[PDB]
């Protein structure tokens, strides 16, 4: 359930400390077109805010 929750919601951390956890990890794969999918699989994020 820990792995399932983190991958399902994108909150990297325990379900109880969801406010503390960083969000936006583990997004839903974009399937509008093939290029969209490829770009989504090669995406980088700066957690700056």
């Amino acid at each position: 359930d820990g792995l399932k929750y983190s991958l399902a919601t994108g909150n990297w951390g325990d379900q109880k400390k969801a406010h503390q956890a960083r969000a936006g990890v583990s997004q839903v794969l974009n399937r509008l077109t093939f290029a969209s999918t490829l770009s989504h699989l090669r995406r980088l994020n700066s957690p700056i805010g």
Partner: protein, 50 residues
């Protein structure tokens, strides 16, 4: 101790963003929405609904 707990509950009912104090929590760590937060600012009662 029970007086302290009652004071905490009342205060967090009115204001749940007090610096230093613990946050009143619903479940799964979700903090309660206090009366002050209903009116505070953007999307609040005044700016958001009047």
């Amino acid at each position: 101790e029970d007086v302290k707990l009652l004071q905490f509950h009342v205060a967090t009912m009115v204001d749940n963003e007090l610096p230093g104090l613990p946050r009143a929590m619903q479940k799964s760590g979700r903090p309660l929405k206090s009366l002050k937060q209903r009116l505070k600012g953007k999307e609040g009662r005044v700016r958001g609904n009047l």
